[PDB]
Amino acid sequence: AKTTILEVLKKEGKPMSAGQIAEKSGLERKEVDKAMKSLKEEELIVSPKRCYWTPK
Template sequence: MSDREIILEAMKKAGEPLNAGKVAELTGLDRKVVDKEFAAMKKDGTIVSPVRCKWEPAKK
């Protein structure tokens, strides 16, 4: 599994919007890796922000 897939899976399992720190804690990935993947996923619309500083997978 890629880092992106691991992050998305953790976000889906949580069932609520998460910040990067919480995602790093849940996945065991380094915070820098999570921040980098978040930036890419924000750009391509994979994740959306329903609340300031928290993200969830986009509903497609």
């Protein structure tokens, strides 16, 4: 297939969505709230990665 997930040494990551979700927001944790953003980013990073990551 196209094999969108393209592992390379330049594999910083080039999906627009999961790229913007590569944010951490693990700082100012306030474990209930911003670590929930850590959870959200892990979810929305794995979901595209499992679907498709690098079309660029």
